[PDB]
Design a protein around this ligand. Structure first.
Ligand SMILES: *S(=O)(=O)c1cccc2c(N(C)C)cccc12
Ligand SMILES: [Cl-]
Ligand SMILES: [Cl-]
Ligand code: NA
Lengths: 94, 8
């Protein structure tokens, strides 16, 4: 592979309960005045893993909205739903 | 540093 940007669109669906999780976390990181959202972890046995979400992927959009336009209230709202759309920048592993 | 973190 090389340096080209590759994005991955993911749609995850699950039961609507407080016991059924996607199995991933995200972080907000600021560096030199630019904020990015990253996949912070992916549970090895979870739905997000099954769907090919990778730790270190950069989240570009959630549910058709730019990551930099997302606040914590929006994230809570979106993440509590039984389906979720993610657009991530993803890197070749090697 | 990370500002914060959410899981679902
Ligand atoms: S920060 O510089 O202490 C910090 C801590 C942990 C992770 C970080 C990342 N990851 C790629 C998410 C980027 C920038 C800073 C940072
Ligand atoms: Cl996790
Ligand atoms: Cl930190
Ligand atoms: Na840390």
């Amino acid at each position: 592979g090389a340096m080209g940007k590759v994005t991955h669109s993911i749609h995850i669906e699950k039961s609507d309960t407080a016991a059924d999780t996607y199995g991933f976390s995200l972080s907000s990181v600021e560096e030199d005045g630019i904020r990015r959202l990253y996949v912070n972890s992916v549970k090895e046995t979870g739905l997000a893993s099954k769907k090919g979400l990778k730790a270190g992927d950069e989240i570009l959009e959630i549910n058709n909205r730019a990551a930099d336009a997302l606040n914590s209230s929006m994230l809570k709202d979106f993440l509590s739903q039984p389906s979720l759309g993610l657009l991530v920048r993803t890197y070749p592993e090697l | 540093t990370k500002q914060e973190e959410f899981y679902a």
